[PDB]
Amino acid sequence: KVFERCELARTLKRLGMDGYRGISLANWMCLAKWESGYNARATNYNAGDRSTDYGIFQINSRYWCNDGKTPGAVNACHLSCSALLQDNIADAVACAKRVVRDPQGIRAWVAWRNRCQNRDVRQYVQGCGV
């Protein structure tokens, strides 16, 4: 499933993402937009280190979920990476909440730094009723 902008915004709000660990909803929308284009089944293989990025927030298999093929990896979210590819994004959200609970916060994703940090991210939630 590929979410539409406002549908995703309302879904994230219902899942308790607005202001989670100081991160506004528009920042989460900006992250999702650049990481996957709001595509819940998106996957990206990183040939360089043999890890794979999964789902709407493109969560990496080295530290967050288990896919069995990533060398010396851990499973901090205690989830199969398969769980991060469902149309129902509850598990991906729970795992993203775990990711930001680390020191770096939202900065854990390089794409956030490149295209969201210090920018006007209001456009991502404008008119969605959130």
- Selected from 73, 79, 108, 116, the binder of Na ion by CB under 5 A is 73
In the bound complex, what is the minimum distance in angstroms from residue 73's beta carbon to Na ion? 3
Long-range Cβ contact pairs of 67-72 (< 8 A, separation 24 or more): none
HSE-up (13 A, CA, CB side) for residue 85 = 15
Closest CA to 2 of 49, 33, 38: 38
- Selected from 36, 61, 89, 108, the binder of Na ion by CB under 5 A is 61
In the bound complex, what is the minimum distance in angstroms from residue 15's beta carbon to Na ion? 23
Stretch that binds Na ion, among 35-43, 57-65, 82-90, 96-104 (CB under 5 A): 57-65
Helix pair 25-36, 5-14: axis angle to 10 deg: 130
Residues of this chain that interact with Na ion (CB under 5 A) are 61, 66, 73, 75
